[PDB]
Amino acid sequence: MEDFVRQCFNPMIVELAEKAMKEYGEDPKIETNKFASICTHLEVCFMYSDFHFIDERGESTIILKHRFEIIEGRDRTMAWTVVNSICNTTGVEKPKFLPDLYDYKENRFIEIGVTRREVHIYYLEKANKIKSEKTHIHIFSFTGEEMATKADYTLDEESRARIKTRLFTIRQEMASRGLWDSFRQSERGEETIEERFEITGTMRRLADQSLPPNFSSLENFRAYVDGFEPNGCIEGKLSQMSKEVNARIEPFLRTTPRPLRLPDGPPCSQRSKFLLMDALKLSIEDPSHEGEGIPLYDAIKCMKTFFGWKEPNIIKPHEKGINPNYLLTWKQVLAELQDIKNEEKIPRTKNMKKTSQLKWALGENMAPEKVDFEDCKDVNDLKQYDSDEPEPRSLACWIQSEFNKACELTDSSWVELDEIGEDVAPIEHIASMRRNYFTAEVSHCRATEYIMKGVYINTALLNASCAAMDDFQLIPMISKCITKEGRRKTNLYGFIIKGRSHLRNDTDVVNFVSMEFSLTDPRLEPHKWEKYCVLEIGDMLLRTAVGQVSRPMFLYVRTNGTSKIKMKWGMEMRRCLLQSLQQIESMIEAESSVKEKDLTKEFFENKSETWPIGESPKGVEEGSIGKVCRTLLAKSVFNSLYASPQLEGFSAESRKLLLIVQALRDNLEPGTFDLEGLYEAIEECLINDPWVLLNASWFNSFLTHALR
């Protein structure tokens, strides 16, 4: 607003307005509405008296002597002197108040005013104020309106149009700058008033009640603050408060730290969505059959490649569920498979008939009814929702074995990344080299199998959920792969049955039952599969040095739930790839900086440099670049699969201890104040998660190594 006034008008007029206001002891920086009003006043005044002159014969002319004389731009004494001189020389009568301009051709004092409101009202106010018929009045409006006595407008149409248009453009610019409203508001009759915002009524009492103890009124507090000067208040307070309020540095030197204590209890149980290291896949090396591509056709063809369907029987019971209903679900799945096989008209999707076993398996209608508390307030059994402490558990070795099997390679390639533009720049070529090396490093790793399997599972689940709103859809768990012979192989891990998919929010859950084939025996580690139901569904011949040995082929059935957000997070698992690379490339680049040359080949093909990437009874184990590549990829993929709040809490509260110990290693003489508090905060995060307990064990091992 003030900046707009300074920029839009001639700077000299700004100076005149500043002087005129300063005559009254005002600062424009505190009041700008008056400043803008005065600037507009001076601008319109000087516009009125411009380009007018008196000819030789006395007639008016446009370009001698100025026909109009300005009085408003001058001081009080100067303006009064000039008006008196005009009165004496031309014998004019003294107006009761100081005019703005003097017209020589008609010899009369004309007052001029620019009004933000209607013209007529301002005309009436001016007439009532002056109370004299010897002064002409000319009122302009920013909107394009004007008025004067008898409509005897002194100027010609051209000059009136110029003034109208200048004011109109000023109004448009003020409006477009978001200041027109305040400008129009500040005009009150014939004066411009400062913006007012005073605390009265409710806020007065509230402020009286929101002050320090030794004050009673907001005004008293303001007076105290205004008159305050810094005289050793802080020094006196420090000299008063007891020494017990202090931050003491506790030395931290090679002996203080201790391992993190894991929670005691029974061994922890698997909780992954799907089987990871115990899965079995029915394979077709080349799907070259009719109607290929549809998941149902591929699933059926994979099914037909296996024989050994024997009568299933509960092996590891669902301790909480109803095992015979799971058995009946599997039997219905098989029967529907045979039926569709003999139909000979396999459609794109298969919808399962609703049944007692299906409805119970997917948790259909097993939910307490909602009632008003007052209606059932007399129930003795009524009690707040159970939200007690989760059962502490113990780290079980199955997690370590799963991770170890995750960070190892496979027989085929589990990634088919898409194409990019041809490399031209040399850096593009180096990037292609590095990307291809990393891809070959982890194009077959197990974690990549997990990524592809989960991606396909969740994609099919969500697509069926949207397409089949109120049907039970049978979704085979299928994956594609490239064998060492370079053949498009298809693998069937199992089947999934989805319940009601009338999903509206991103957190409400759809319940499904997943039946994954397997070759492990749950009875070996029952606590691992305490959420699963296992049916020995067949026998499979496995080849070994002693020929073909028959083994029992199991089928883990479980009931799970997935939310839209969880399905999306499942389909995002491929991003895990990037994470791994982003941690190795930096290292590569780092060494390049210290060597001033590329190091992709001397790292991805030297196979001599190593990093400590594990533990063994002999000591610490060192691994090559590929070992670290797949280790980090597996860690990222598992973090995706075993995400839990306790994981992030422990990570955040353990980073601090990591940094403290590292600072000690760098000989920086670290110190701490309440280290036991940090230990307690870290320990609070270890309750039940297998992943978090494993990470805690890893940190204990690392601390043990680093301390020595």
Partner: protein, 759 residues
């Protein structure tokens, strides 16, 4: 029709009518922010879910007539449905692909024209050159850099005006219809986009993207040009680098240098003047930089220099609370200091009156080739850190810092007199003289400054007095960082005070800027500079004086022509012609004046042979006592810095080149201007229907007739007044102009009158 019937429906209800009649168009955009819907969180998940549906794409009703219900395979393209909130029929991606593969075809002739920015990127890439990568430690200094090359650097308001005139012809605000400068770019774009079916909103957005400037704070390690920023990903890395060069066209302007020179001249010529403030203001108000007034450039360009900063302080604006000393932009960061005046005796028995800062202050300096920090106590240098590409940059930066410190130790280390005087022969202040003296030689000071050992740590190294790296010993508080130091992150602009001496004083009573700190170097004006001020052609020289004279003549061409046709004598005795005759030799000016005067006599005697170019060329020569002569001149000498330059009366000359094909006039290569004509029958009515030069006459008037659309105003007769709809639906009475003036010259006479009255 549909629109008016919908408006009637809206008016029928009470609430819609109340909102229509109450709210003014000014606040329309305020009631555009009252959306009762709900923004979709995580739109990626929503899109994934939506794509699975049958008809997730919304099309318009007309699609029913062009795309059939089903394709050959009987797939359903569009469904007889409507969207939630409108009549947008529902269609599937099949509809989009069917339209692409079998829809009606047209010509995308305007697409390259509307999308010149993207295709410019394409061309810049297609013609680039690459080079070997280099692997080494990378230092990416952080700074502000352009984004989009090809911009006109217009202010957002100007870009909006251009877009409104180009694509919204009959909906332009009142400012345009009360405007005179019809930018050439606007007419160019209007011609380019004659028949363009592209959505006008898309055209407007693309023009806005094309004509606006944008700046971002990035870490760069190499070239900083705009075309070198769009490929910063491809060029710079954390451990590597890529040699690349765009192969398009660069548009590096030079107006900044012209403004530097103009401000420097203004300050240099006003410091000696009686009233520098009002004088400099009058100059800045009446000066033109390449066809544009300097006030717009000062308000627009973000230049930072002592001259321009003092100009802003005089005019009244905000400037950085810092000074560019010794070629380095300084900036206070911490601490406070008090300025005290003192007299200091140097090592050459020279007494100097200086003002030193006492306090524990800290400053950061950013130069063209270095970056440094300095912690200084009361007349005591405490700590100094510098980082620079070359040793010479290091040395000059350290010399600047030590002279700024103004410590007593160096005072006794001065050898030789300090009597440096700028090119204007104005005594230089003691600190600048000391700076120049130590620039000339500082070995003696280095030997007697101070030497002490320093602990060795990573990332920083010492310096011996011969300016060589050292790890075991350095100078007192002098150190160099092996890694580049990031420049200042922000600048503080505060209210400052300016005195008549063009010294800018802070609110605390200290001084901030002085004209003596302004460099006295002289440059060349790439673009012509025109002045209408007083006898200020002191540094202009003959080269630019000729162009200024021709510009002054052509600005007042109408008045000059009228005077020549009626009162040649008074025109000849005009004061403004004084400097031209200074160049012409004093032994021949009379002959030239007489020859041109008799030529004009013959010209007026004859009719039908009018030639504006000859009159413009030969007018300035007719301003001297016209001694009679008979020899028929053919080349009138024109002295130009000791080099006789002649002017051929007939035909073009190097000192006066007018091209008829382009109707453009230039003098000594430099741009001069152009003439106002087109047909060979003395009229200027043949134009592209420039819709400018209209004056409103208050609210709508019924007598004048039914309101007209702006596009059809062109039919109005000279001076006829009608009713037209300007803005977004504001009917006003407008007229054509009759008096050939403008809004710029208003208030100038009263301005000077009241200025005389106040003083």
């Amino acid at each position: 029709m549909e629109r008016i019937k919908e408006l009637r429906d809206l008016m029928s209800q009470s609430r819609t009518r109340e909102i229509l009649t109450k709210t003014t168009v000014d606040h329309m955009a305020i009631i555009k922010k009252y959306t009762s819907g709900r923004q979709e969180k995580n739109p990626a998940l929503r899109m994934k879910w939506m794509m699975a549906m049958k008809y997730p794409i919304t099309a318009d009703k007309r699609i029913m007539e062009m795309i059939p219900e089903r394709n050959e395979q009987r797939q359903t393209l569009w469904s007889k449905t409507n969207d939630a909130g409108s009549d947008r029929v529902m269609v599937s991606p099949l509809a989009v692909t069917w339209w692409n593969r079998n829809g009606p075809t047209t010509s995308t002739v305007h697409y390259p024209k509307v999308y010149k920015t993207y295709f410019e990127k394409v061309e810049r890439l297609k013609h680039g050159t690459f080079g070997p990568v280099h692997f080494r430690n990378q230092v990416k200094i952080r700074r502000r850099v352009d984004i989009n090359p090809g911009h006109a650097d217009l202010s957002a308001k100007e870009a909006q005006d251009v877009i409104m005139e180009v694509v919204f012809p009959n909906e332009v605000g009142a400012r345009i219809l009360t405007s005179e400068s019809q930018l050439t770019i606007t007419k160019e774009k209007k011609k380019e986009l004659q028949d363009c079916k592209i959505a006008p909103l898309m055209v407007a957005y693309m023009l806005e993207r094309e004509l606006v400037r944008k700046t971002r704070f990035l870490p760069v390690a190499g070239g900083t040009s705009s075309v070198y920023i769009e490929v910063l990903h491809l060029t710079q890395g954390t451990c590597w680098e890529q040699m690349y060069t765009p192969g398009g066209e660069v548009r590096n302007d030079d107006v900044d240098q012209s403004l530097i020179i103009a401000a420097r001249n203004i300050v240099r010529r006003a410091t000696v003047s009686a009233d520098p403030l009002a004088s400099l203001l009058e100059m800045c108000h009446s000066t033109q930089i390449g066809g544009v007034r300097m006030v717009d450039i000062l308000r627009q360009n973000p230049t930072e220099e002592q001259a321009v900063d003092i100009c802003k302080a005089a005019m009244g604006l905000r400037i950085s609370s810092s000074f560019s000393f010794g070629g380095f932009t300084f900036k206070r960061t911490s601490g406070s200091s008090v300025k005290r005046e003192e007299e200091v005796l140097t090592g050459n028995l020279q007494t100097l009156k200086i003002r030193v800062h006492e306090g524990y202050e800290e400053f950061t300096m950013v130069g063209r080739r270095a970056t440094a920090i300095l912690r200084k106590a009361t007349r005591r240098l405490i700590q100094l850190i510098v980082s620079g590409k070359d040793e010479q940059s290091i040395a000059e930066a350290i010399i600047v810092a030590m002279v700024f410190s103004q410590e007593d130790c160096m005072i006794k280390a001065v050898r030789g007199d300090l009597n440096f005087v700028n090119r204007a022969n104005q005594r230089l202040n003691p600190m600048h003289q000391l700076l120049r003296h130590f620039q000339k030689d500082a070995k003696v000071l280095f030997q007697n400054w101070g030497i002490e050992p320093i602990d060795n740590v990573m990332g920083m190294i010492g310096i011996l007095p011969d300016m060589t790296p050292s790890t075991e010993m350095s100078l007192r508080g002098v150190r160099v960082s092996k890694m580049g130091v990031d420049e200042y992150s922000s600048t503080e602009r505060v209210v400052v005070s300016i005195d008549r001496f063009l010294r800018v004083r802070d609110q605390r009573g200290n001084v901030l800027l002085s004209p003596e700190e302004v460099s006295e170097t002289q440059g060349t004006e790439k673009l012509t500079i025109t002045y209408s001020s007083s006898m200020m052609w002191e540094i202009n020289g003959p080269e630019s004086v000729l162009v200024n004279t021709y510009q002054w003549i052509i600005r007042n061409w109408e008045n000059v022509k009228i005077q020549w046709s009626q009162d040649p004598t008074m025109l000849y005795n005009k004061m403004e012609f004084e400097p031209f005759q200074s160049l012409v030799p004093k032994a021949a000016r009379g002959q030239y004046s007489g020859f041109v005067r008799v030529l004009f006599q013959q010209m007026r005697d004859v009719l039908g042979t009018f030639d504006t170019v000859q009159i413009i060329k030969l007018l300035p020569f007719a301003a001297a006592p016209p001694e009679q002569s008979r020899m028929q001149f053919s080349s009138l000498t024109v002295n130009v810095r000791g080099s006789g330059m002649r002017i051929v009366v007939r035909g073009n000359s190097p000192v006066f080149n007018y091209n008829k094909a382009t109707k453009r006039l230039t003098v000594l290569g430099k741009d001069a201007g152009a003439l106002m004509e087109d047909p060979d029958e003395g009229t200027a009515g043949v134009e592209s229907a420039v819709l400018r030069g209209f004056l409103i006459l208050g609210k709508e008037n019924k007598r004048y007739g039914p309101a007209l659309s702006i596009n059809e105003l062109s039919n109005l007769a000279k001076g006829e007044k009608a009713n037209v709809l300007i803005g977004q639906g504001d009917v006003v009475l407008v007229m054509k102009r009759k008096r050939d003036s403008s809004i710029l010259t208003d208030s100038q006479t009263a301005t000077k009158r009241i200025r005389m009255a106040i003083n």
